Amino acid sequence: SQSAPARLITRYRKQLPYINFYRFCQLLEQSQPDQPPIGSGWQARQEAVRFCPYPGMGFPASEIKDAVIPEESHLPPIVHVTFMGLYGVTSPLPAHYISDIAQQREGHEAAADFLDIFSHRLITQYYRIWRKYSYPATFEAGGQDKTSQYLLGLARLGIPGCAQNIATPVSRFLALLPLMLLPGRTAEGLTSLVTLLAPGTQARVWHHDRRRIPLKTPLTMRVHHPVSLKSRPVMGDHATDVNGQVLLQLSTQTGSEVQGWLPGGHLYSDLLALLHVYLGSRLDVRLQLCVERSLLPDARLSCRPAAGSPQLGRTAVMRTQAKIATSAARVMTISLGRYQRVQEHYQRKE
């Protein structure tokens, strides 16, 4: 752009004798990042790019102290550091091209532009290795889940192609990466799942609960004569299934976080980070908070009725101090059903 020398070399022209080129060419792409002249498409179309006046220097890395940018011939790069910069330069010129320049004379000053056509395109990709291609520590590449670094060093957890149904898009690996890797596990990681997403919030997990109904279609409290069997089922009409509906409580103190844990705030964040990320169909997670006396509205109109079920919070009209309580429930993170029906056909005779 016109703006890139106009931002860099016209304003901040005091560090050019002591500038790092790796720093410099980074700040070039940060200078025009929106539709950048993307350096990967260099393999056909350096025409209409207008890159920096680096070539002709013969420099090693971060040696760029010379800095001359014209404005007129529709291209910045016109640099020939003469008698220095012998970057691989070994021998004199051959016979026919000296006769083309006649005779290694001041016409070489208009010939080095052609002659440096290779060293133009080489130090491009030499930089491209160092900063974007295979170095970047996932810290220079530093993208917004776009970089091939992220897609390589993230897919080992096992999310390629699965961009379906992820509302807050896949970026919160950054804590969960070792913890999502040990298989069939665990209990501890859910506390980290809280600690990332909101500070100051403390929690404990109880391993089992008295889960109830599931209502069964044969009632069987009348005996059979023809087919009456015993072994396991001792019950009446409702059953309790303990077996994997683990239970969580939370501990905050700041009403911002408390109204950050309203239905509306950050409650939907954990609801996403479970049901497609870490648990899926293993379990069901029951939620609860225990806080102080009341932070409560009134019974008015259309849509904020439910803190789940419970509603209180105007009976305190009198007392000057308070007490703690438990807050409410939030439902299991579930995914279930029956689809409808019964079938017609069969598998195989072997």
Binding site: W42, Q43, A44, R45, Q46, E47, S73, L75, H96, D100, I101, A102, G107, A110, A111, D113, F114, I117, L122, Q125, I129, Y133, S134, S148, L151, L152, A155, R156, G158, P160, G161, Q164, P183, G184, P214, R232, P233, D241, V242, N243, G244, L275, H276, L279, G280, S281, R282, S335, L336, G337, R338, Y339, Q343, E344, H345, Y346, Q347, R348, K349, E350
Partner: protein
């Protein structure tokens, strides 16, 4: 392509110079060259070629970055798949003077001594697990409808009056469906009609043959894109993939002991009445080329063992041998596998085990004379590979005095298309072929085929795949993947096959003695590409054994597939797939 990145730079240099010799100050001298005109071999050949190497190699590496840690599918090992030979078709075999005989045919029959080509040679190649045969072949295969209108088939009255069938034991005599399955409902119906068989009634009037033990028919192995789907469903293949056609499970086809209520002169009946309740379409014709007796597959696997010209120095020898550097083998022939060597100095120096055998930490707990194989690619223009390989502790001892190291080297050959082979029998077994054997070469062979390495996605997308990670999947996640990754002969027929799929969702099964967090899923779709109820069961059948495998890292996982046949249909298959414990 190698020519692709070549063609990038061939554009690039000219588009550089057209901006230069126009107005830019190298037109002080080279405008005098291009007005006079310089498409020179002096300048334009060599200098473009000089830029072309760097526009090839560094460009091609940095475009893709084929990192080293992508070589760990090696320790997962299905990955011998990356060079699949030509599917030589099922071969055929006639009678040989049927009189009191029972054939006994070992495998390893080299065939096709005839088909040399223009720049092509004769290809010798092997069979896989040849079968003792029994001399009889009925020659009329006729659809016949009943007075009650039910299309039935023909009797076994071929060679019963000539041979000692009391001496010949008839159990499980297979037959792969012949060239009427090109009507691509023939193998569909005729197999799925045998999902609904009834018994048999034959008139022969020859008190010779009273057996049981009805066989597996077949004819799946025509296909080879449905086939790798059934391949990785038995991770457990680790030795059986080494000739790689695995005819041990036979692609399950059963009919049980089918009882001949055999009848006297004139009376008969070979019913399959349950599917035969719906007999053939009028556009399903009959043809006397459902002739299927001795259909045995061969693959394009050639053999040799080159000269031990080894070793001096270090591991960098990679076996360019004059049997392969023989010219007709130079041009096309390559190497598939390298087995069984390391017999120099003593009888046991560095056997070919330790390249794969070690799979963990106690490397210092390892005795000496051990091994590793590394690999490469080869020549630009072909799929060639080269194998720098060496020892583990004796090269750390540095004595190149080990010479008589053996070689067991298998390989195959490339070609050019528009081939059509020349079928002959090359070799005959001793004292068994009373008369010789003709070869019919039932269909056309396929090509060599190679996996997609052309994508960091489509390379690492399998590196995920083989896990217990299926926790939520939908129909976008399946049709996109990785069913495409098992499809390397990628046809528009195949494109019509995969793209049927529409809707996938999960629900949760809860029958119990005790709790049983269980589940089971549902998908089946449109009636066109994989639309025959034969192939609607067959391509289904390759899928189910995949779907059973990835089941659980915890016992709360449980799969059963119901499947909605057409937009108007219904089907379930499975039985509940209770894996034994898999943490």
């Amino acid at each position: 392509l190698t020519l692709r990145y070549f063609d990038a730079e061939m554009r690039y240099l000219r588009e550089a110079g057209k901006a230069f010799a126009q107005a830019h100050p190298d037109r002080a001298a080279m405008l005098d060259l291009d007005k006079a005109g310089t498409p020179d071999p002096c300048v334009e050949r060599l200098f473009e070629g000089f830029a072309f190497s760097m526009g090839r190699l560094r460009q091609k590496i940095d475009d893709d970055l084929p990192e080293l840690t992508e070589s760990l599918v090696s320790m997962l090992w299905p990955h011998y798949l990356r060079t699949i030979p030509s599917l030589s078709v099922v071969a055929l075999t006639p009678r040989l003077s049927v009189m009191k005989m029972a054939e006994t045919v070992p495998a390893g029959l080299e065939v096709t001594s005839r088909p040399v080509g223009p720049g092509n040679t004769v290809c010798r190649y092997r069979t896989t697990r040849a079968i003792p045969l029994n001399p009889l072949a009925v020659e009329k295969v006729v659809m016949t409808t009943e007075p009650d209108g039910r299309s039935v088939l023909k009797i076994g009255f071929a060679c019963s009056e000539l041979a000692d069938w009391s001496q010949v034991d008839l159990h499980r005599l297979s037959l792969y469906l012949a060239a009427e399955a090109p009507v691509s409902s023939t193998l569909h119906l005729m197999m799925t009609k045998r999902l609904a068989a009834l018994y048999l009634r034959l008139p022969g009037n020859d008190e010779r043959i009273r057996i049981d033990g009805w066989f597996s028919p077949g004819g799946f192995a025509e296909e080879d894109r449905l086939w790798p789907k059934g391949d990785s469903a038995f991770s457990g293949y680790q030795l059986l993939l080494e000739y790689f056609t695995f005819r041990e499970k036979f692609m399950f086809v059963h009919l049980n002991g089918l009882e001949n209520v055999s009848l006297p002169a004139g009376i008969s009946g070979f019913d399959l009445e349950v599917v035969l309740s719906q007999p053939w379409p009028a556009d399903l014709p009959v043809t006397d080329d459902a002739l299927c007796l001795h259909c045995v597959p061969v693959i394009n696997l050639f053999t040799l063992e080159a000269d031990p010209l080894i070793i001096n120095g270090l591991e960098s020898e990679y076996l360019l041998r004059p049997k392969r550097l023989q010219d007709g083998y130079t041009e096309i022939y390559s190497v598939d596998a390298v087995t069984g060597s390391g017999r120099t100095g003593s009888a046991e120096y560095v056997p070919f085990t330790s390249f794969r055998h070690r799979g963990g930490m106690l490397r210092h707990d390892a005795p000496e004379r051990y091994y590793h194989t590394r690999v490469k690619r080869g020549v630009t223009g072909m799929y060639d590979t080269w194998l720098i390989l060496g020892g583990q502790r004796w090269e750390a001892d540095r004595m190149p005095e080990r010479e008589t190291l053996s070689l067991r080297i298998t390989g195959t050959n490339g070609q050019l298309p528009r081939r059509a082979l020349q079928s002959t029998l090359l070799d005959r077994c001793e004292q068994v072929l009373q008369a010789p054997v003709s070869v019919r070469n039932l269909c056309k062979p396929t090509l060599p085929v190679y996996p997609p390495t052309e994508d960091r996605f489509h390379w690492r997308v399998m590196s995920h795949l083989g896990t217990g990670f299926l926790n939520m999947l939908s129909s976008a996640e399946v049709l996109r993947g990785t069913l495409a990754l098992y499809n390397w002969r990628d046809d528009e027929l195949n494109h019509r096959r995969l793209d049927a799929i529409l809707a996938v969702q999960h629900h949760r099964i809860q029958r119990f003695e005790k709790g049983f967090l269980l589940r089971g899923l549902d998908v089946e779709v449109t009636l066109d590409g994989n639309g025959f109820a034969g192939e609607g069961d067959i391509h289904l059948f390759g899928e189910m054994l995949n779907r059973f495998l990835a089941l659980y890292a915890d016992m709360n996982q449980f799969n059963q597939l119901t499947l909605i046949v057409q937009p108007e249909g219904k089907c379930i298959r499975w039985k509940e797939n209770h894996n034994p414990r898999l943490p």
